[PDB]
């Protein structure tokens, strides 16, 4: 069905590597993911990690990408959110059901 990417972040507290599966969008070299966490009240821990340490590793099939993660700008949100929703309509439901704006993370080389 929908492929997952494996995102590795550095635990902001422990400094240990943390891996989590996510759905993703490609924009050339960029990988885009949404810190939706099924519409939880709070941002997922991996998001907190990458905001404390922007260096992340992303594995897609056999490709291992060393990228730098940051929040999408207003204009990037406008471009990527609708693509994310088209690919996985549940994203819009999560956003509908949660207070926080769901972060969109741009991972770039
Ligand atoms: C519960 C927590 O996970 P989390 O980082 O909040 O991630 C929540 C979810 O987003 C994560 O489980 C995703 O993989 C769920 N998930 C998706 N989550 C998404 O947000 N978006 C997706 O598109 C998505 C797709 C998906 C597909 C398949 C699947 O099985 C899961 C999918 C966790 O793993 N707990 C760790 C925390 C590890 C950690 O980062 N700790 C930090 C400190 C954190 C802190 O400061 O409190 C550290 O080591 O220092 C632990 O306690 O052992």
Author numbering: 43 to 151
Sentences from the paper on this structure:
A deazaflavin-dependent nitroreductase (Ddn) from Mycobacterium tuberculosis catalyzes the reduction of nitroimidazoles such as PA-824, resulting in intracellular release of lethal reactive nitrogen species. The N-terminal 30 residues of Ddn are functionally important but are flexible or access multiple conformations, preventing structural characterization of the full-length, enzymatically active enzyme. The split barrel-like fold is characterized by a central six-stranded antiparallel β barrel in a Greek key topology with four α helices: A at the N terminus (the putative helix removed for Ddn structure determination), B after an extended loop between strands β3 and β4, and C and D between strands β5 and β6. The identification of these residues and the lack of classic catalytic residues in the active site suggest that Ddn functions primarily by precisely orienting PA-824 for efficient direct hydride transfer from F420 and potentially through additional transition-state stabilization.
Cocrystals of the NΔ40 construct with oxidized F420 were also obtained in two space groups and were solved by molecular replacement (Holo-1 in C2 at 2.1 Å resolution and Holo-2 in P21 at 1.8 Å resolution, with an rmsd for one chain of 0.3 Å over 109 aligned Cα atoms). The data from both crystals yielded clear difference electron density for the F420 coenzyme, with two glutamate residues in the tail that could be easily positioned. The crystal packing combined with crystallographic symmetry operations reveals the same decameric ring structure in both structures, with five monomers in the ASU of Holo-1 and ten in Holo-2 (two rings per ASU). In structures Holo-1 and Holo-2, F420 binds to a groove on the surface of Ddn through a series of hydrogen bonds and several salt bridges between positive charges on Ddn and the negatively charged phosphate and tail of the coenzyme. The sum of these interactions results in the Re face of F420 being presented for reaction with PA-824. The largest conformational changes between the apo- and F420-bound structures occur near the deazaflavin ring. The loop following strand β3 (residues 76–85) shifts away from the binding site in the presence of coenzyme in order to form the direct contacts to the phosphate and deazaflavin heterocycle outlined above, with the Cα of S78 moving approximately 4 Å in Holo-1 versus Apo-1. In Holo-1 and Holo-2, this loop packs against α helix D (residues 131–139) and generally exhibits lower mobility, indicated by a drop in atomic displacement parameters (ADPs) relative to the apo structures. Modeling was used to visualize the binding mode of PA-824, using the Holo-1 structure with F420 and placing the imidazole group of PA-824 at an appropriate distance from C5 of the flavin ring for hydride transfer (based on observations for other flavin-binding proteins; Fraaije and Mattevi, 2000).
